[PDB]
Assembly symmetry: C2
Homo-oligomer: 429 residues x 2
């Protein structure tokens, strides 16, 4: 349709996936969100080395199939993660080196891909191969020590194991074009195409935080890699803070590159995140959509301080007598130029007034008063501005409502079940 991420993404020929954790599929709230919003799936850990080959030569796909089965059963495609890398290697593989490790690497690829032959759309054949020391060179691991040619071997090996799959190179901190790591990966992919090494895509994990923040030049990076003759994909997206603007900007970068297959966010709810502390996903603990979700959905569909006029009463959201007192319920009044009517929507999804006061709801049920309270980040102060013009309380899940459909000055604002009514739509100015 256009009401869920997967569907909106499809309007541009793209997909929108998430990372599924089999241990959570038993959680109905989890599966309800995951099944409805995404049309692409990645196993968070079930298809990795230690999970698929517990002992040398002994393969094990019970965990992986558990995820795969759920995906196909729910009309989702699957991304294979990951075939050859230094992290999460089972004990036995960690003790290997030289040609012994090299062949173990090849045997692992053959075993996993053979089992999933023709069922996986994309395979992260190699991941985390470059360093972060800022040199843009190869990562120093037991795999790289077997010879610089190990990555090329894994790809030729993967192409032979399942010709139907797209073979991707996956890595993080390669989104900023100015970072050496990014360029090092570009030169390798470039080298591969020139020599005819099988490689169909580059996956940019996209784990953004204040350590390695999103930079708008990410679009040039996608363009650049796409120009090498490969498809690009945002594979493990999550943003510390979950800024609406940052999440919206990444969505647009991909929509600007025809070779960008889609976006996968690393998880469903912040509580499921490997970095829940950074609350970097689109849904939060209770399964409610975050400000960033709306921003992402809006971007997929096409897309400072100001006033919030209610298209249906003509009056603006106003703080009674321009009070600065916490607990003051807002009202509707004749739009004019005064700070008591200037609302700023933040990347956190707050409707700030006076700079540090936040549109607040002291409850969740219908009839709950909408007031101003010191900003502290509570979901009861977070909002989602829907494209239809409604403002939904992230925590309540209710729309800002003009009491008794009133339209006269002094009409209080309240929380009520959304109705698409005129007393629930607004326009920014």
């Amino acid at each position: 349709a256009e009401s869920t991420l997967g569907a909106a993404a499809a309007q541009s020929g793209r997909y929108f996936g998430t990372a599924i954790a089999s241990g959570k599929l038993g959680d109905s709230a989890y599966t309800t969100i995951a099944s409805r919003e995404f049309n692409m799936v990645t196993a968070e850990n079930e298809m990795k080395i230690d999970a698929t080959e517990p002992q040398r030569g002994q393969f094990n796909f019970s965990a992986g199939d558990r995820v795969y089965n759920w995906a196909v059963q729910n009309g989702k495609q699957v991304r294979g993660h990951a075939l050859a890398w230094h992290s999460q290697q089972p004990g036995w593989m960690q003790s290997l080196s030289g040609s012994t490790l090299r062949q173990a690497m090849i045997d692992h690829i053959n075993g996993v891909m053979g089992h999933y032959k023709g069922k996986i759309a994309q395979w992260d054949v190699v991941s985390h191969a470059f360093s972060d020391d800022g040199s843009g060179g190869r990562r120093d691991s037991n795999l790289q020590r077997t010879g610089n040619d190990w990555i090329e071997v894994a790809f030729r090996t993967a192409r032979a194991a399942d010709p139907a799959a797209k073979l991707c190179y996956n890595d993080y901190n390669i989104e900023n074009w100015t970072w050496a790591k990014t360029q090092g990966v570009y030169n390798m992919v470039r080298d591969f195409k020139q020599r005819g090494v099988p490689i169909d895509c580059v996956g940019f994990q996209s784990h953004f935080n204040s350590g390695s923040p999103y930079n708008s030049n990410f679009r040039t990076t996608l363009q650049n890699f796409a120009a090498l003759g490969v498809d690009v994909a945002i594979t493990e997206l999550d943003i510390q803070g979950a800024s609406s603007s940052t999440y919206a900007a990444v969505t647009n970068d991909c929509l600007a590159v025809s070779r960008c297959l889609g976006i996968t966010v690393w998880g469903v709810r912040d509580t499921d995140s490997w970095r829940s502390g950074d609350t970097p996903l689109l849904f939060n603990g209770d399964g409610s959509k975050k400000a960033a979700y709306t921003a992402v959905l809006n971007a997929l569909n096409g897309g400072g301080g100001g006033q919030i006029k209610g298209v249906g009463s003509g009056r603006c959201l106003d703080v009674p007598n321009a009070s600065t007192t916490d607990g003051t319920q807002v009202q509707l009044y004749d739009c004019h130029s005064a700070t008591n009517q200037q609302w700023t929507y933040t990347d956190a999804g707050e409707l700030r007034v006076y700079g540090d006061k936040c549109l607040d709801a002291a409850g969740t049920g219908n009839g709950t008063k909408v007031q101003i309270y010191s900003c502290w980040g509570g979901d009861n102060q977070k909002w989602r501005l829907n494209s239809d013009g409604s403002i939904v309380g992230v925590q309540s899940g209710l729309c800002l409502d003009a009491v008794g459909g009133g339209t006269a000055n002094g009409t209080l604002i309240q929380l009520y079940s959304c109705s698409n009514g005129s007393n629930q739509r607004w326009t920014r100015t």
Copy 2:
């Protein structure tokens, strides 16, 4: 003395306490904070009715004493809580009614106060006596039905039991002077004082949140009760969101009333709170001091938009070329009127620039670069403004530092072990 809350408050003859949970006195991380920051203690539950008299006439002081001893052995006074109220009554008292209840109430008071006779500074003789129905009348409880004079009786009983302890009436939602409930309590205490009813104080639980927000008239309330000849005390303070200003405001209201004995916060760390979802205390779960902690400390020691100038350099905190790019490290620069030099300290402990950008630290160690990043509420975007001029990151516990003690334009800002150096002191005007 003024490096800890207890000592700072002691400067003015007051105390700063907390609520101790017997179950955590074996948690060194917990006791390390508690024993250092407070000089007044209240058993969070150990001294309540159900806890001290599990069977009528059969008293159990095992847990109360554990807390009482820990307190005295650690230089803290003790507030008994609570002797006669409707909540948390053992199952056998709830069933009681009429004169048999009145008698039980009397005996409980004598039994418990007898045990602690002479050891308790303050006793919450009666608590939660008034309703929240707007009429300013007594809440309808099995105790109130035994006769409206139960409160007076409990107090006369208490006085006789321990003439040495200060007897307080305790309640919530009686901080706002305009509320009916507050007036009801006011009249009762005023009536008691005139008739000679032995009540020495009124405790204001002070549980503030968007539901029952703090209001500056709280001081007026305190001042009015004090005028009646009874001491006042903030007994169970906690503020939803832990706003710096609100916490400092409550502290100054008590400093403003000579009869205000002191302030008690209902818990040590947010994780210990009965309402952790509201992160209403002064210490985070990891034990680090929150922005509000310093706001209170500074206040105890006597005490929108602007420049932050370095003392040692004479230059201001500046964002290179007014960039709004996340990850941009800030520097020192000749002070001038421009938005890339106007920082706003919010109640959340943030230092905002451009309205929605936050002073950000991407790590917790020395040499961590200080930059701007979209505001989202992380502890690495919260700061404490020490009274010495230094600015300490909440999460890191590190000071803003002008690299290498540089004083020239272009000197970058980093995190570093606080040293009282002039490249770590700042004056904001």
